[PDB]
Amino acid sequence: RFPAREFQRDLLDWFARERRDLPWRKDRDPYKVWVSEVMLQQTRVETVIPYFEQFIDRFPTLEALADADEDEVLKAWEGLGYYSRVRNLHAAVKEVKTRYGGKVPDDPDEFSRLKGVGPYTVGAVLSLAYGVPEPAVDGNVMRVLSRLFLVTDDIAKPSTRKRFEQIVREIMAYENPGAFNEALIELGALVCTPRRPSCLLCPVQAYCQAFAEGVAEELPVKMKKTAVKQVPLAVAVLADDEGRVLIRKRDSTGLLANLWEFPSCETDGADGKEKLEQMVGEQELTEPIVSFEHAFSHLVWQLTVFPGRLVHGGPVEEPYRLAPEDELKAYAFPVSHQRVWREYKEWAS
DNA sequence: AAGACGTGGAC
DNA sequence: GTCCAGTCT
Ligand code: SF4
Ligand SMILES: [Ca+2]
Ligand SMILES: [Ca+2]
């Protein structure tokens, strides 16, 4: 029904001919492949390149990453987003050391048991670093495979992902799966793109049923995004007479887990300053200086910055921490509060 | 199932 | 504005 062998030759050829020279394709090392594939989840290649090199420069081996403390690994991830990925990788790596003594499992079932390792990562790491013919179905693969085979099912469904995963089994090159998988991902990245794909340039344009029908731009099928919720947030930038600033470490559960931030509180509506004042007193503000929005995937933060002065009438208890201005750079803030700071600094000038 | 979970490019 | 570059619960 489908000439796989020919398909697999025109794909791998184009790949060897067009592949990008990315930092994590310098070698087939499980550790570096693993880090790169976690960074790449929901994150474009061009964004990841700098982070991958800072990260591997700071954590060259699996044991270096395991031996580091949360703050250091999480600082290395500052600005990337979806920060539970690095908490799960940090733990998944601490596991391979305490349990497996540092060697990355090559058994699919054994590798998936680690936190952060979903179906894609199992296929990406094992097929590249060990040759295991497990599929690595990402958004690129799902877009390619849906166009090639005219699969008209909602990709958002996990069931559709499992269908694609069986298609991959059927047309794979079991000889060299890692090369086969990266070629599908690369194909979707460079040629068969979400919009106006270069089907003429495409090396497998003869096989693409969508091109034959002229409906490539109508695929893949994915339902429209759910509208996100708006959330007013009030932020306080408090500095004493020695220039030190107060910050707190968010809890390890939920949004922006274990990241540092300037004291804040969700304000249903009115009395932003009052709510900030009372909340800080339990565990001296002035008017706001700026207000802006910051988007998440599932909600929007409408922030409002309140400068303030604090006088020490007691000790700074957890989760709070009194940090000089020069030492803030050592803490990992989300992008929202990195701007809060920048806004406060330029206002005071 | 589908909401939670960051941030930035390309239309 | 829209779409999009995965995993956990
Ligand atoms: S022929 Fe066109 S639609 Fe099909 S895979 Fe190639 S770029 Fe995508
Ligand atoms: Ca798993
Ligand atoms: Ca929480």
Nucleotides of C under 7 A from a protein CB: 2-8
d(CA A119, CA A181): 13
Q: Which of the ligands is closest to the CA of residue A212?
A: 1
Q: How far is CA A16 from the centre of its chain?
A: 27
A193 SS3 class = coil
Q: Which of the ligands is closest to the CA of residue A255?
A: 3
CA of A156 to C1' of C3 (A): 13
CA of A33 to C1' of C9 (A): 27
Query: 3-state DSSP helix/strand/coil percent for chain A, to nearest 5?
Result: 50, 10, 40
CA of A224 to C1' of B2 (A): 13
Nucleotides of B under 7 A from a protein CB: 2-11
In chain A, residues under CATH classification 3.90.79.10 are 229-349
A118 contact to strand C (CB, 7 A limit): yes
Whether residue A219 contacts residue A147, with contact meaning beta carbons closer than 8 Å, is answered with yes
Select from A213, A222, A217 the least CA-distant residue to A160: A222
CATH code of A21-132, in short, is 1.10.340.30
Catalytic residue among A37, A134, A186, A343: A37
Q: Which residues line ligand 1 (CB under 6 A)?
A: A 144, 147-148, 191-192, 197-199, 202, 204-205, 208, 210-211, 216
In chain A, residues under CATH classification 1.10.340.30 are 21-132
In chain A, residues under CATH classification 1.10.1670.10 are 1-20+133-228
Whether residue A273 contacts residue A285, with contact meaning beta carbons closer than 8 Å, is answered with yes
Reported structure resolution in angstroms: 2.0
- Residues 6 or more apart in contact with residue A272 via CB below 8 angstroms: A232, A234, A288, A304, A306
- Residues 6 or more apart in contact with residue A155 via CB below 8 angstroms: A139, A142, A143, A146, A161, A164, A220, A221, A222
Whether residue A261 contacts residue A337, with contact meaning beta carbons closer than 8 Å, is answered with yes
> Which of ligand 1's atoms lies nearest the C-alpha of A199?
2
- Longest C-alpha distance within chain A, in Å? 79
Topology (CATH) of A229-349? Nucleoside Triphosphate Pyrophosphohydrolase (3.90.79)
Cis peptide before A197 (omega within 30 of 0): no
d(CA A76, CA A65): 11
The DSSP secondary structure of A219-279, one letter per residue, reads -S--PPPPPPEEEEEEEEEEE-TTS-EEEEEPPSSSTTTT-EE--EEE-SSS-HHHHHHHH
Architecture of domain A1-20+133-228: Orthogonal Bundle (1.10)
Whether residue A233 contacts residue A303, with contact meaning beta carbons closer than 8 Å, is answered with yes
In angstroms, the first-to-last Cα distance of chain A is 70
- What long-range pairs does A7-12 form, CB within 8 A, spacing at least 24? A7/A171, A7/A204, A7/A207, A8/A171, A8/A172, A8/A173, A8/A180, A10/A203, A10/A204, A11/A180, A11/A183, A11/A184, A11/A187, A11/A203, A11/A204, A12/A173, A12/A176, A12/A179, A12/A180, A12/A183
d(CA A165, CA A99): 30
| Integer angstrom CA distances of residue A166 from A40, A75, A131, A161, A188 | 23, 39, 18, 9, 18
Obtained via which technique? X-ray
Is residue A37 annotated as part of the catalytic site, yes or no? Answer: yes
Q: Cα dihedral sign for A250, A256, A258, A262? A: negative
